[PDB]
Structure formats: structure tokens, C-alpha cells
Amino acid sequence: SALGKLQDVVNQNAQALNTLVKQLSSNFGAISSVLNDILSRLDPPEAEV
Amino acid sequence: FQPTNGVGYQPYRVVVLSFELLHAPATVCGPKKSTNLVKNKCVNFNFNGLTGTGVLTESNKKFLPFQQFGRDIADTTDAVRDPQTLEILDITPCSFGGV
Amino acid sequence: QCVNLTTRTQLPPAYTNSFTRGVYYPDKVFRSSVLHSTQDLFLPFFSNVTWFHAIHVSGTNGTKRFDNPVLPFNDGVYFASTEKSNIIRGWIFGTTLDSKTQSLLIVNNATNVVIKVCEFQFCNDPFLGVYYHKNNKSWMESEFRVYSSANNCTFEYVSQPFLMDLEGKQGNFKNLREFVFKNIDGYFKIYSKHTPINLVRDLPQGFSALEPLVDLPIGINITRFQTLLALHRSYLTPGDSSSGWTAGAAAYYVGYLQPRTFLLKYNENGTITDAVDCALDPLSE
Amino acid sequence: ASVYAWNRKRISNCVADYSVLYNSASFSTFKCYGVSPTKLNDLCFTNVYA
Numbered sequence A: 001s002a003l004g005k006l007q008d009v010v011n012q013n014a015q016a017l018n019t020l021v022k023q024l025s026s027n028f029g030a031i032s033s034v035l036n037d038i039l040s041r042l043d044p045p046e047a048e049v
Numbered sequence B: 001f002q003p004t005n006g007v008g009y010q011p012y013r014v015v016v017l018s019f020e021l022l023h024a025p026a027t028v029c030g031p032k033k034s035t036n037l038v039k040n041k042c043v044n045f046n047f048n049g050l051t052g053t054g055v056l057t058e059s060n061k062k063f064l065p066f067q068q069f070g071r072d073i074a075d076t077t078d079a080v081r082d083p084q085t086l087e088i089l090d091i092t093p094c095s096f097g098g099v
Numbered sequence C: 001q002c003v004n005l006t007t008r009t010q011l012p013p014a015y016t017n018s019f020t021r022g023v024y025y026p027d028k029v030f031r032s033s034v035l036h037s038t039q040d041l042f043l044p045f046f047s048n049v050t051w052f053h054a055i056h057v058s059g060t061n062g063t064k065r066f067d068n069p070v071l072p073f074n075d076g077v078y079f080a081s082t083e084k085s086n087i088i089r090g091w092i093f094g095t096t097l098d099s100k101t102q103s104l105l106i107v108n109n110a111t112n113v114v115i116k117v118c119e120f121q122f123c124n125d126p127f128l129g130v131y132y133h134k135n136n137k138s139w140m141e142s143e144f145r146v147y148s149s150a151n152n153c154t155f156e157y158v159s160q161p162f163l164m165d166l167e168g169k170q171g172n173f174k175n176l177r178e179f180v181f182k183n184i185d186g187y188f189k190i191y192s193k194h195t196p197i198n199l200v201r202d203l204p205q206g207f208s209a210l211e212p213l214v215d216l217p218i219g220i221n222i223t224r225f226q227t228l229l230a231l232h233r234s235y236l237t238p239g240d241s242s243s244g245w246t247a248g249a250a251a252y253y254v255g256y257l258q259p260r261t262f263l264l265k266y267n268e269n270g271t272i273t274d275a276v277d278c279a280l281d282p283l284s285e
Numbered sequence D: 001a002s003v004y005a006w007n008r009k010r011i012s013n014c015v016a017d018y019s020v021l022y023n024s025a026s027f028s029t030f031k032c033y034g035v036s037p038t039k040l041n042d043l044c045f046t047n048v049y050a
């Protein structure tokens, strides 16, 4: 535990990247998160919404 | 059924095949088709319900006898087993970047 | 062939603690060296389950402990039986058990397994029958008085025939069979795991990952179930169909699942080697 | 069977290949009622009475 800052920087970057990746599987108030299922199983207007 | 009558007094074995939908999950359905295994090319694949785009290499990730799909620490599709032949493939997106 | 058995005293059941058991694979996804955190129905750690007894010894002055109550079915059953002579031999899952609704019949008799789904008129004490002979020395499955009548059935299932041991071996228990029965979205998914054992008392400590076995699409509303044990009618105990039956030596544990978060630990091959709870102790949280 | 004792043949848990019925030359009537015989290869059912 001597090079704490050099490891903490990499850990923070990895956590930021992981959060950015995981923010793709959220509904955000929509029906689902996959776009093709949304545009296939729904009418054009609600799909675009 | 005397074998001397006309064409209107002969046996007619009739089948009354019917179809109906209950609330239980469907267990009898029609057949499905399959294409060739074109690997080492960024194509569109759909094995059993999942979609995606990317080359399909032949990696060495050994799955369990009952496991079918495969993911990573990022929770993304990475390796799908072929249904016909028990050969674990590997999914990796093809070339992309800036010029 | 319904027959109400007699000569069976009453006694308050025991409660043995479950030492970190009841962890099964939630899905069919492969993960290598991933500390995945899932949320599904599991058994809380360090929770005691009901210990049903089934024994008949000379010390027992006419008790003949043969327990098979109609237990409830809330969300799942962590069925675990420590057998040595193959006593637990099926289950009679159902909803009403009065020949009005369907009931899942899973019984592995002498030949093979028959997963039948039909409307049956069950008795008040279902069991199997194995008769011992003093001339050729062979245990034979004779009595099959589980139900009394059939009706218009549904999707059934059979398997290839085989022969088990069917012998009253002496000594401590040598087998352990764990099961998890979940029923959601018209899917009665069953998990299983068979590990050896050399214990003679309450469920041992350890950890095992139960693998999926079958996903029969039956679509029922099972909310109450029971067990299917087997007696050991031999030349020793005399009498009739109501009195004079042995019970062997076996025991089965029954637990109930509850919704709670768990933290799994996948190995470098895909097998769960260890898991931790989320709501047990502050360190676990 | 007989006309008053028509025996049913409820069958499930299979893969029904309908491409063998209408591609035959041994029947006399194939008057399906609103099932699109050429489209039966993409419709799933629960029980098939016979």
C-alpha cells in the first residue's frame, strides 16, 4: 500500500467507465431499454417517443 | 358398405383436426429453418432469441453442460453456444474507429 | 386402495438449523471470475427448518413415527432428505387433492419415473408398499395406493426403466438429495443436487450449487403439497392392512423460500464456489 | 372408429410438420377453415385434437 494515488486514479476511471456502460440498461421512463424491440412491438409514434 | 354401390355410398374416412389456444405455454408448433455457419465476418446472428452484430470466432471458453449464453464483467453478450453443434463461439464487434 | 393407518402417536416436531445451504443457479448465463449480485427467491442463511422424523426402533414403544403432513406451498420448498434405503420416493404436489383440480404427480416407482399431470382422488395417507420375503430374499414393490381414480389427463412424461437398490442397509446415512421447487409463469422448474454424506444427525454444514433439472410446462396453481414415503411390511410385524407395518429409517427437511438479495461468486470455470447474504449481519451487508 | 363413438387423439409436446398433408395426392377434401394451411409453419398451439 505505497502507491495509493496511482491505483486510486485507475480505480476511479474504471468505476466511471463501468457506470457509463451500465447506464445503457435503464428504462429512463420508457417501456424497455432495447431499441429494436421498442420499434418492432409498438406503433411508430410511441416508439419514437 | 357393399362393394357394388355408386360413388355416393362408399366409406369416407374423415379427420376433424382442430386447433385451440389454452392459457398454458405452447408446446407443439411448426418446424424452424437454419442457415450456414459463416464465421470470421461481421454479420447479423439470431440463434435462439438474441440478436447482435459482429464476427463469430472460435474461442476456448468452456461452458457448463446446461449453460447456453455467456457474459462478462460488463454484463454484455460475449459468447453464445451454437444450437446444432456443441461448439462455443465468441462474439466480438468488428473494426470501428476514426479516420 | 385407500386405507387409514393406525398405531401412530403424536409428538412435537424438531427444528434443525440450515447452515448456509439453498443456493442455486438463477439463470443460464456464463460468468467467469465475476462477483455478480442477483436478487431472487432463496433460503435465508442460519434459518431453522422443520425436521420430520421417520423411524421405527425397539426403543419406540409403539410410536411408529411415520410423518407425512399436508404442508403448505408459499413460494418454494427446499426439500432435503437423508436416505440410506431409498425411502422418500416421490411427491404429490397439488392444489386441492379432492378430484376437482389437477395435481402434479411425480413418483419414481420400481421401474422408472412418471411425471403425470391429471385429476386424482388421493386418500388421506398416501404411501408405497415394499414386501420382504424369507424364501427368495427379494424386496418387491407391490402396493401403489397413492390415488383411487383417474380422469381426463394432460401432458405426462415417462422415462426408461431401471432398478434401484431396495434393501434395508444398516448404519448411518450415506446419501443426500437436495431439491428446490419453484412455480412461476406456468413453469414448475425443479433443481437437484446429489452429494455423499457420512452423518447420522441434523443436516451437515457446507455449500453446494443446485443445477436446473427440468422445466415442465404444466401451468397449475399448486399451493399445498405432501410427501410420498414407503413402508417395510415384512414377516416380522403381523396384523392387517391397517396395523403391522414397519417404517425403516429416514428423515427429510422442508424449508420455505423468501425474497432476499444474495451476492454470488463465480469461479474460473462457471461453478459457484461461495456466496454471501445481504441481510443477515452488518458485516454481511 | 364409428360415427357415434368418435375417438379423440389429443396429442401435444411435438413438432407438427404440416408440409406432408397438403403435399400429398391421396385425399379428396382439404377445406381448411381460416387457418391458412401454407402459414401453419409459423403458428404455435397448445393442444391438437384429432
Ligand SMILES: *[C@@H]1O[C@H](CO)[C@@H](O)[C@H](O)[C@H]1NC(C)=O
Pocket (backbone or CB within 6 Å): B083, B084, B085
Ligand atoms: C443435428 O444434425 C446434424 C447433421 O444434420 C448433426 O451433425 C448434429 O450433431 C445434430 N445436432 C444434435 C444436437 O443432435
Ligand SMILES: *[C@@H]1O[C@H](CO)[C@@H](O)[C@H](O)[C@H]1NC(C)=O
Pocket (backbone or CB within 6 Å): C002, C003, C004, C124
Ligand atoms: C379415513 O378417514 C377419513 C376421515 O375420517 C375418511 O373420510 C376416509 O373415508 C377414511 N378412509 C377410508 C378408506 O375409509
Ligand SMILES: *[C@@H]1O[C@H](CO)[C@@H](O)[C@H](O)[C@H]1NC(C)=O
Pocket (backbone or CB within 6 Å): C015, C048, C049
Ligand atoms: C425454529 O423455527 C421455529 C419456527 O416456527 C421457531 O421456533 C424458531 O424460529 C426456531 N427455534 C429454534 C429453537 O431454533
Ligand SMILES: *[C@@H]1O[C@H](CO)[C@@H](O)[C@H](O)[C@H]1NC(C)=O
Pocket (backbone or CB within 6 Å): C109, C110, C111, C112, C114, C141, C142, C144
Ligand atoms: C411403475 O410404474 C410404471 C408406469 O406406470 C408401470 O408400468 C410399472 O408397472 C410400475 N411398476 C410397479 C412395480 O408398480
Ligand SMILES: *[C@@H]1O[C@H](CO)[C@@H](O)[C@H](O)[C@H]1NC(C)=O
Pocket (backbone or CB within 6 Å): C133, C135, C136, C138
Ligand atoms: C419370491 O417369493 C415370493 C413368495 O412365494 C413369490 O411370491 C415371488 O414370486 C418370488 N419371486 C421370485 C423371483 O422367485
Ligand SMILES: *[C@@H]1O[C@H](CO)[C@@H](O)[C@H](O)[C@H]1NC(C)=O
Pocket (backbone or CB within 6 Å): C152, C153, C154
Ligand atoms: C377435463 O374435464 C373437466 C370436467 O369434465 C373439464 O372441466 C376440463 O376442462 C377437462 N380438461 C382438462 C382438465 O384439461
Ligand SMILES: *[C@@H]1O[C@H](CO)[C@@H](O)[C@H](O)[C@H]1NC(C)=O
Pocket (backbone or CB within 6 Å): C267, C268, C269
Ligand atoms: C477448472 O477447469 C480446469 C480445466 O479442466 C481444471 O484444470 C481446474 O481444476 C478447474 N478449476 C476448479 C475445479 O476449481
